[PDB]
A paper describes a structure:
Toll-like receptor 3 (TLR3) is a member of the TLR family, which plays an important role in the innate immune system and is responsible for recognizing viral double-stranded RNA (dsRNA). TLR3 primarily localizes to endolysosome and is activated by double-stranded RNAs (dsRNAs) released from viruses or necrotic cells during viral infection or inflammation. The structure of TLR3 complexed with dsRNA reveals that the two protomers of TLR3 sandwich the dsRNA, interacting with the ribose phosphate backbone of dsRNA with no apparent sequence specificity. TLR3 dimers laterally form a higher multimeric complex along dsRNA, providing the basis for cooperative binding and efficient signal transduction.
Therefore, we performed cryo-EM analysis of TLR3 complexed with 90 bp dsRNA, which was designed to accommodate two dimer units of TLR3. Subsequently, we collected cryo-EM images using stage tilts (0°, 30°, and 40°) and reconstructed a cryo-EM map of TLR3 complexed with 90 bp dsRNA at a resolution of 3.2 Å. Although the stage tilts partially improved the particle orientations, the map was not of high quality due to the lack of information from missing directions; however, it was sufficient for locating the four TLR3 molecules and most regions of the 90 bp dsRNA (81 bp). The two dimers were related by a translational shift of approximately 90 Å, corresponding to three turns of the dsRNA without any rotation around it. In total, the width of the tetramer was approximately 240 Å, covering approximately 80 bp of the dsRNA. The protomers from the dimeric unit on the same side of dsRNA are proximal to each other in a head-to-tail arrangement (TLR3A and TLR3B, and TLR3A* and TLR3B*, wherein the partner TLR3 is denoted with asterisks). The residues in C-terminal region are negatively charged (E524, D525, and E528 [LRR19]), and those in the N-terminal region are positively charged (K138, K140, K145, and K148 [LRR4], and K164 [LRR5]). Since electrostatic forces reach far in distance, we hypothesized that the electrostatic interactions between two TLR3 dimeric units facilitate higher-order oligomer formation of TLR3 along dsRNA laterally, possibly resulting in efficient signal transduction.
Numbering used by the authors: 28 to 195
The structure:
RNA sequence: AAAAAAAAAAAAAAAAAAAAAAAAAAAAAAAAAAAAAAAAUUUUUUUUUUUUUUUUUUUUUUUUUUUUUUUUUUUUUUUUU
């Protein structure tokens, strides 16, 4: 099964077909990376409500439900790199007010609309790379008060304009 | 028909590390070899120059014996004109 080993559920390559929810729920770090994940269940995380950070990356996940943000209010690191994520919106990030780290290395998010990060105030580093971005614009209002890293690499931005860079 | 994410295999090529070895070249250390130049203990041989002993040839010198001719100093008994 998973490693556990003092609150670091580093679940390595074990061909886990479904997301497990075992007895050791009193942990803070859980690693779903390198595990067969069809999608993240919005209701299966009730058992593990003490996950300070989670590592669910490289997995094949279609879309993210808003419930995941409210089932785990104490969420700091959201590493979701190398996923499908055909389309995303602000609704899935409504309850993620304590988010501080995000990783998205391959998601093919060509178009971004509205303000997906209106509720993210403590989000420090941003990793939006290799997602086929055509413009660097993220919104029209002023948001992301405390941002230190904005990674936009391997994308297809053609030019930079003052209108699309005024959101910070 | 096309494009991508977890999850398991296999094939060509390039650059690497470790281990078991095997050859070629180069360094010493030992056991020997063939020699052209070397030194040192013993017994012998040839040749040159010199020492000692013995036996003999030639020449020279001293002494003694004997023999033959000359200068001869004398004589006794006689002869002698
Ligand atoms: C949630 O748990 C149920 C019951 O164990 C299971 O049937 C379902 O597949 C799980 N879903 C996810 C997303 O883990």
């Amino acid at each position: 099964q998973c490693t556990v080993r003092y609150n670091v559920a580093d679940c390595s390559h074990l061909k886990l077909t479904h997301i497990p929810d075992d007895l050791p729920s009193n942990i803070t770090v859980l690693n779903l990376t390198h595990n067969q994940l069809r999608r993240l269940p919005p209701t299966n995380f009730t058992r593990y409500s003490q996950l300070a950070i989670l590592d669910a990356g490289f997995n094949s996940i279609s879309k993210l439900e808003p419930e995941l943000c409210q089932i785990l209010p104490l969420l700091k690191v959201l590493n979701l790199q190398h996923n499908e994520l055909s389309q995303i919106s602000d609704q899935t990030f409504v309850f993620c007010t304590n988010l501080t780290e995000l990783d998205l290395m391959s998601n093919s998010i060509h178009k971004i609309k509205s303000n997906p990060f209106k509720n993210q105030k403590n989000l420090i580093k941003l990793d939006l790379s290799h997602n086929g971005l055509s413009s660097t614009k993220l919104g029209t209002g002023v948001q992301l008060e405390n941002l230190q890293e904005l990674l936009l690499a391997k994308n297809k931005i053609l030019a930079l304009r003052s209108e699309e860079l005024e959101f910070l």
